[PDB]
From a paper:
Here, we study fold transition between distinct β-barrels by protein engineering and structural biology technique. Here, we discover that the previously reconstructed ancient DPBB sequence could also adopt a β-barrel fold named Double-Zeta β-barrel (DZBB), as a metamorphic protein. The DZBB fold is not found in any modern protein, although its structure shares similarities with RIFT and OB. Furthermore, the reconstructed OB fold could also be converted to the four-stranded SH3 fold by a simple circular permutation.
To examine what determines the DZBB–OB transition, additional intermediates have been engineered by sequential mutagenesis and experimental validation steps (design-12–17).
Residue numbers in the entry:
A (entry chain F): 5 to 55
B (entry chain A): 6 to 55
């Protein structure tokens, strides 16, 4: 359907994992923390999608 | 590459439009993320940049 997207607003570091966690912002103004891939920058948009 | 995880649980909170899914990543780590409507338990989701 419509692409499920969120804007990356902050990039944090998870020390347990050596991996980035982005603070993201949904269309309704909700903000959550997600594991993201490498190469994500603040200001990008990420999609969650079935494979 | 392809950053993926398998939906283990899925819950519709009447408080938001999108459902909350508990996903299992590569190493076994589990977290709660918002998924699109129509994700069912057992699906694999991908987090990618657009």
């Amino acid at each position: 359907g419509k692409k499920f997207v969120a804007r990356v607003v902050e990039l944090l570091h998870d020390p347990a994992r050596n991996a980035p966690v982005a603070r993201v912002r949904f269309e309704d103004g909700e903000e959550r923390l997600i594991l993201v891939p490498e190469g994500i920058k603040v200001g990008d948009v990420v999609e969650v999608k079935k494979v």
